[PDB]
Amino acid sequence: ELQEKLIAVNRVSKTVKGGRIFSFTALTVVGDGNGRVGFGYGKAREVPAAIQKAMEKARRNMINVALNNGTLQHPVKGVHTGSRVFMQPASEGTGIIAGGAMRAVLEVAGVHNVLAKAYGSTNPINVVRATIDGLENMNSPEMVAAKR
RNA sequence: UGAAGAGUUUGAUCAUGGCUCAGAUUGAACGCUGGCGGCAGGCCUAACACAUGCAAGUCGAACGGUCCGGAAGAAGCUUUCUU
């Protein structure tokens, strides 16, 4: 069934009036591997409490990547905040060559081969979004033909 | 078939910006730590000054002598001497 992947976890600390309250954050990637992905980022006092809460949010917000022979349709360049992400399809026998933040989202996405890179800001939280955003702008011939 | 950087300016944030960190190479070394074996390699600093040996000779089917070697003579032997 659905498969999860922990991108990264941050301690996170804020100076609240009365002392220091700690709240852990966590980036999770839920995906079956045949065309669906899900990014979640929830907070919690405990690490596991955030991990679980994150996976729940990731499964609530999923997208459908139109995979084609273990690859993507056309190249895309998503630009979230200061961060930037680019994607480019590649023939078989290539391998998911990209950042851990993107690869983890691509592996579960079902993508078998793809070339990518991060530009501008490289924030792990901003790159994942730019990644899922680019996976949305993705279109197929049937879509471009039907929508036209 | 080809592209994942990070740390440091704030009380905190973003932007700008310089510095800095692990990579490969160099006819080297010093500091402290030594067993062995293959292969490879050695003044990257004063073209600073240099002891000593060595770094080009070979031809007599070009021509007269000396040195080294062999053979044959005048002699009973030796000296000497000739071809």
Curated annotation (Swiss-Prot):
One of its GO terms (molecular function) is structural constituent of ribosome. InterPro entries: Ribosomal_Su5_D2-typ_SF (IPR020568), Ribosomal_uS5 (IPR000851), Ribosomal_uS5_bac-type (IPR005712), Ribosomal_uS5_C (IPR005324), Ribosomal_uS5_N (IPR013810), Ribosomal_uS5_N_CS (IPR018192), Ribsml_uS5_D2-typ_fold_subgr (IPR014721). Keywords: Acetylation, Antibiotic resistance, Ribonucleoprotein, Ribosomal protein, RNA-binding, rRNA-binding. The keyword Acetylation applies. NCBIfam families: rpsE_bact (TIGR01021). Altered uS5 proteins have been identified in a number of mutants. Some mutations in uS5 have been shown to increase translational error frequencies. Some mutants in this protein can partially suppress an alanyl-tRNA synthetase mutant. Part of the 30S ribosomal subunit. Contacts proteins uS4 and uS8. With proteins uS4 and uS5 encircles the mRNA as it enters the ribosome, which may play a role in mRNA helicase processivity. Can be cross-linked to mRNA. In collided ribosomes contacts ribosome rescue factor SmrB. This is Small ribosomal subunit protein uS5. The gene is rpsE.
